[PDB]
Design an enzyme around this catalytic site. Structure first.
Site, mmCIF file in Angstrom:
data_model
loop_
_atom_site.group_PDB
_atom_site.id
_atom_site.type_symbol
_atom_site.label_atom_id
_atom_site.label_comp_id
_atom_site.label_asym_id
_atom_site.label_seq_id
_atom_site.Cartn_x
_atom_site.Cartn_y
_atom_site.Cartn_z
ATOM 1 N N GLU A 39 79.551 42.212 46.127
ATOM 2 C CA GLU A 39 79.737 42.079 44.736
ATOM 3 C C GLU A 39 80.826 40.984 44.562
ATOM 4 O O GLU A 39 81.811 40.963 45.312
ATOM 5 C CB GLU A 39 80.257 43.404 44.209
ATOM 6 C CG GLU A 39 80.413 43.389 42.659
ATOM 7 C CD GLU A 39 81.018 44.690 42.105
ATOM 8 O OE1 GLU A 39 81.895 45.262 42.785
ATOM 9 O OE2 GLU A 39 80.635 45.102 40.971
ATOM 10 N N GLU A 94 83.656 42.608 31.368
ATOM 11 C CA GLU A 94 83.788 43.960 31.907
ATOM 12 C C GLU A 94 85.048 44.641 31.319
ATOM 13 O O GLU A 94 86.105 44.043 31.257
ATOM 14 C CB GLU A 94 83.829 43.911 33.439
ATOM 15 C CG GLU A 94 84.389 45.218 34.140
ATOM 16 C CD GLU A 94 84.198 45.253 35.652
ATOM 17 O OE1 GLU A 94 83.697 44.257 36.200
ATOM 18 O OE2 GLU A 94 84.520 46.307 36.310
#
Length: 190
Positions: A86, A177
């Site tokens: 990620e 986010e």
């Protein structure tokens, strides 16, 4: 139109991913072309944005506005598989620097900026492949900014040059986010 549970698809030529673990109210809206908008108040965790899937190390240009009272990230954000990674090229964030306590590995210059490079392990955590273990890589811009050009190929090249393993690209988006925070962003990716 506006959505509040997790959803991915394509919109005006762009892959989009909106993921929320349900906490607070998070509202995500696809705009025209590469634009999206998200607004959140007392969220849990969520990620949202437009880009490509599978990605191809796009030189990404984005613009817009990103604000938070608390812990949020504006990053070029994606995944690789085989190996599963990620990654974040973190352009701005709020009250918390997510590289805190991660392993520093070096610095990279790109698009007029300097980024510090960090790696950590995420073990038995949620992923694009379900619950999994994977590395998580960061380029964190030494000064915050909201808008400009990110040549993601330079980051990927510096990560590998420093010894990090990278797999085949999966999605890559310009992600807002949030984490236990409130705020809003409206971002146009191209």
């Amino acid at each position: 139109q506006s959505i509040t549970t997790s959803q991915t698809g394509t919109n005006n030529g762009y892959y989009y991913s909106f993921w929320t673990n349900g906490g607070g109210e998070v509202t995500y809206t696809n705009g025209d072309n590469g634009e999206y908008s998200v607004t959140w108040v007392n969220c849990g965790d969520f990620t949202s944005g437009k880009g490509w899937n599978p990605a191809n190390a796009q030189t990404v240009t984005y613009s817009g506005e990103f604000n938070t009272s608390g812990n949020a990230y504006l990053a070029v954000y994606g995944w690789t598989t085989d190996p599963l990674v990620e990654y974040y090229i973190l352009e701005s964030y709020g009250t918390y620097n997510p590289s805190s306590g991660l392993t520093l590995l070096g610095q990279v210059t790109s698009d007029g900026g300097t980024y510090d490079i960090y790696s950590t392990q995420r073990v038995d955590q949620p992923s694009i492949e379900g619950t999994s273990t994977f590395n998580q890589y960061w380029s964190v811009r030494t000064e915050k900014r909201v808008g400009g050009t990110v040549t993601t190929a330079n980051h990927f090249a510096a990560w590998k040059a420093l010894g990090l393993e990278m797999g085949t690209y999966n999605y890559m988006i310009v992600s807002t986010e949030g984490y236990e925070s409130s705020g809003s962003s409206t971002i146009t990716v191209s």
